[PDB]
Symmetry: D2
Subunit: 118 residues, 4 copies
């Protein structure tokens, strides 16, 4: 279910492969920010979720550096997968930028992305 | 190189990591607190080409709390930066999400911050 | 514009009064959690926003204690007001619970609420 | 009572506050960093009836960065707890939102954490 191509409210493209062992692998393409084309991503997820109606926790990282640019920063998405007729992945993220110790106080942005397969 | 090694945070948790030349991070994490025991696999990414100034190196990693002994049905992601030198440090802020029913979703995510100190290998 | 009765995706009721000086005052009633009836709230907002198309930053707090219960915790909402045909207040919150120093690591929840007048 | 007084965080910022018996917090804040100068009004709320155990006192306050000298078109909210005793502390986590256009909304909110130390009044 998790495996596939997903899109968030901003129009970004998330392409993941979920291994049976609990690994997440794929590429991420952002529709906004100091970025172009695809970026490697790696993460983990609960490969044995609860039997009740709970979602399956997951999380991945993306360092914003590839062959075209280096924004000198990383983003981590933490959230949960909810299956069904209209599957979705609701997350919250932390975008940290490399900074001098003097600007460390304003180095981390926080947001929330919702991904669907549409 | 700098990032690679054994680190510990203020909680007494252990962070063993290796930085690949492609910007990949792999290793194991051991939490001193929470519903967890033994080692859990971790995977992340970092800026393999930081600015040559006094800036830190942005990085991040995830850890799904499930191994061959326990499953907490949750995942934590650490987002922060590495700061080298004599006293190398990794200052991070994290998000720990628990799997929940639709009704309890609003209280599924905890937020915190850990500071890691590296041990002379 | 900010003044009025708002509702979030959870069904909670937010009733605010925005003073000309930049003060926020009102009551908050949550549809979920260890809470019942109304709770006092106080906050601040930019009473002189930018002339471009920017939203107006705002933020308020609610200690979860009233005549009926005391959940021993506080919530702060930080976000921005966007006027127009369909006004809304998009926010992100931090819910801190009073805890022993040993549980301090898991004392703060983080989320995001969207309020509309519907 | 405990909370009331002058406090400072690791950045060198000043936090003057008074705790009302109704659970209200009022005072002024002075930031050591950012687009700010002089004092800004603050308002918050706290648990005026904490648990008699070793628990902390939950509290929170907002500060819109606008006074008679500057307007940064932003607001910060601090959420945390007070911990009394010999060395009283206020450990918090904050959210600073900037007013932005619809297009830049995604990068409107910064997240951090401040620790406040009280000064013997
Ligand atoms: O400036 C950069 O480094 C690019 C930031 C991209 C960010 S990550 C969180 C948000 N979600 C998304 O799909 N794109 C933006
Ligand atoms: O899932 C659980 O119950 C274990 C949570 C462990 C958490 S992750 C953030 C925090 N840092 C750490 O070293 N340990 C705790
Ligand atoms: O258990 C409690 O203290 C009540 C928590 C209520 C929380 S505040 C963030 C979320 N938004 C809302 O409208 N209700 C919930
Ligand atoms: O709006 C601005 O540019 C000023 C931001 C000041 C921020 S609020 C969180 C942080 N703590 C503090 O004492 N100062 C900074």
């Amino acid at each position: 279910g998790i495996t596939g191509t997903w899109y968030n409210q901003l129009g970004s493209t998330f392409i993941v492969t979920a291994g049976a062992d609990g690994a997440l692998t794929g590429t991420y393409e952002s529709a906004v920010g100091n970025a172009e084309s695809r970026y490697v991503l790696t993460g983990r997820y609960d490969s044995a979720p609860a039997t009740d109606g709970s979602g399956t926790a997951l999380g991945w990282t993306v360092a914003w550096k590839n062959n075209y640019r280096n924004a000198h920063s990383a983003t981590t998405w933490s959230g949960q997968y909810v299956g069904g007729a209209e599957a979705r992945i609701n997350t919250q993220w932390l975008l940290t930028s490399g900074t001098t110790e003097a600007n460390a106080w304003k180095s981390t942005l926080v947001g929330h992305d919702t991904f669907t397969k549409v």
